[PDB]
Ligand binder design. Structure first.
Ligand SMILES: [Zn+2]
Ligand SMILES: [Zn+2]
Lengths: 208, 208
């Protein structure tokens, strides 16, 4: 019955080597330059060619959703994939291969990353909802400005656990995976209440 | 751990008699005129003076949130209350009486319905999130345009179950309680997917 508002954190062991994750692993950009790191170049979990990264959490049942900020990113993909998807080479990001996606490519939105399913959106998307109903075989996408439906993929027998999926098709342009709401978690609330609480990859550059 | 994105439906047995609920009990307005109905004028669950209505579901544990559309409503209150709150006469809608609220009154937003806690918001709110962390004693409010925090009430020992709470301080102006996202639930998904799916109290009037 209950819809889970997921708290998505990225899995750095899946991330293509050109992706730079925030310290909190909740935002990611593709950087043109290398950061000297501790990370294995080509462990089997890692996407080696497609500039992709997965959420750490997998879902095997139930209803789940999360939201992604994509303003100022010209090329991106969001959605869900099987935990078993192929990671190596020029993987086709299509349902038949275990990927259920929404893409921005060359100023258009494409259902299931298909040049034959251009979605006739009438505004630039800024915050996209990704929705999963596992048993119903449903991956759906929402415009979170007005909570309006964008697309539901053809219904699928997922069979294995699925994970949040992300692709960055352009450089120097971060996406932000919106944390689940937490209220005042961890924060002292004064006797009159806590007002307008505020707690970035936007400042990451290579011109130091 | 998990945040519940609640699907809130109103309880008509709590609603002040001047409130008119949509057929699906997910939106409400205060109407100046009577609708000939089947409803008891003054059952003990019903607010008799404060123009208020509760959600049907109560929460005794965990983290929960829901969202409310309030555009074009000049006077409204949203929040959480104890299931045990007083229903009769001119109840003071304050924490000490079991009400944790955010109010729009006379062009200002007021924390806990207090004329002494005017919130310095810099935009007109359109969609408000109401958040509960029961064990942490937390009722929080969010601006869902950008998922920004507005206010957390002083932390409270709720003790008994709590319910969604709504007040309509003006006439002919509906609030819409946003349904939990459902993807394509109940809807046939064509072989190419389902595109831009669309499924009102805005048309309710007394000039027939
Ligand atoms: Zn960099
Ligand atoms: Zn009416």
């Amino acid at each position: 019955t209950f819809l889970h508002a997921v708290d998505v954190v990225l899995d750095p062991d899946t991330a293509h080597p050109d992706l730079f994750l925030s310290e909190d692993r909740r935002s990611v950009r593709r950087c043109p330059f290398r950061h000297l790191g501790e990370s294995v170049p080509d462990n089997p979990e890692r996407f080696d060619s497609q500039p992709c990264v997965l959420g750490r959490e997998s879902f095997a049942s139930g209803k789940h959703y999360w939201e992604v900020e994509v303003e100022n990113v010209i090329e991106w993909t969001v959605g869900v994939c099987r935990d078993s998807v192929e990671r190596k080479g020029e993987v086709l990001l299509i349902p038949q291969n275990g990927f259920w996606t929404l893409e921005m490519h060359k100023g258009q939105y494409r259902a299931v990353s298909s040049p034959d399913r251009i979605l006739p959106l009438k505004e630039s998307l800024c915050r996209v909802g990704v929705f999963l109903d596992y048993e119903a075989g449903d991956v759906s996408f929402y415009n979170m400005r007005d909570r309006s439906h964008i697309y539901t993929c053809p219904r699928s027998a997922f069979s294995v656990p699925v994970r949040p999926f992300f692709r960055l098709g352009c450089e120097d342009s971060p996406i932000f995976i919106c944390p689940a709401l937490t209220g005042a978690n961890g924060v002292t609330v004064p006797e009159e209440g806590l007002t307008l609480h505020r707690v970035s990859l936007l400042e990451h550059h290579h011109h130091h």
